[PDB]
Amino acid sequence: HHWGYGKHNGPEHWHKDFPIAKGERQSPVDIDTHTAKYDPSLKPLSVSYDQATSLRILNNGHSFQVEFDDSQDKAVLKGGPLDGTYRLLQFHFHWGSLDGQGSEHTVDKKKYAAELHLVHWNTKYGDVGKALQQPDGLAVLGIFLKVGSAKPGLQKVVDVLDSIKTKGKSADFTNFDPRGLLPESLDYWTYPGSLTTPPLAECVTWIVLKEPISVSSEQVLKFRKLNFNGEGEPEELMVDNWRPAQPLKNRQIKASFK
Ligand SMILES: CCCCNC(=O)c1cc(S(N)(=O)=O)c(Cl)cc1SC1CCCCC1
Ligand SMILES: [Zn+2]
Secondary structure (H helix, E strand, O other): OOOOOOOOOOHHHHHHOOHHHHOOOOOOOEEOOOOOEEOOOOOOEEEEOOOOOEEEEEEOOOOEEEEEOOOOOOOEEEEOOOOOOEEEEEEEEEEOOOOOOOOOOEEOOEOOOEEEEEEEEEHHHOOHHHHOOOOOOEEEEEEEEEEOOOOHHHHHHHHHHHHHOOOOOEEEOOOOOHHHHOOOOOOEEEEEEOOOOOOOOOOEEEEEEOOOEEEOHHHHHHHOOOEOOOOOOOOOEOOOOOOOOOOOOOOOOEEOOO
């Protein structure tokens, strides 16, 4: 009876195995755009992904993830609200069964069809397992997806999903450029938060871009064809793999823009 996203094992149940689920800096949150404070001392985000080395794509049973070589500074996030250098580990998505849901963060209670998370770890901690134990260990760049025109840079990901349909399947996935998933603007909101999946560790500086990317209805349909189950098990479509907004508590969301 491991955690997941169903009625019997979904977000309302996670606190029993992961008590931090009810902690003081949980994610995601609703971004109330009128309450976020413009902070003129926030720096522009520096996304340096020119030397990114993608390695593999994996269906982990909760999402799918594209993994990168993070054994040297090849794909790094710096600047913005961060101190020092964060290496890209992997990206993955959360999505819904319908286009009016699927994002984890919300903006003035608006849900997007999906959310992309680019997960990075602070190099000062040496490895991601150590970074998970630190309040400034991770930084996640979150990007909303709306349905409209296709995102050309997402198509190589979509096209290989059939080969990783079920839990535990992986494929080689080299030469993928994550720059092709970014919107034009790097304007963002930021707040201190957590993983949105177990173990829900409170180690994340969230950087959520204000501009969504557009994907097509056919791209998100391919996400919804993936399975939570492993091969040869009863089919359970991987949809609605999102945690809903958690209490902001004693936190301020800061905007990089006016
Ligand atoms: C048990 C893993 C289930 C799937 N979760 C993730 O892949 C994941 C999601 C987020 S999120 N939705 O906040 O961006 C983040 Cl920040 C880190 C990780 S992978 C991380 C898990 C703990 C061990 C180190 C890698
Ligand atoms: Zn995520």
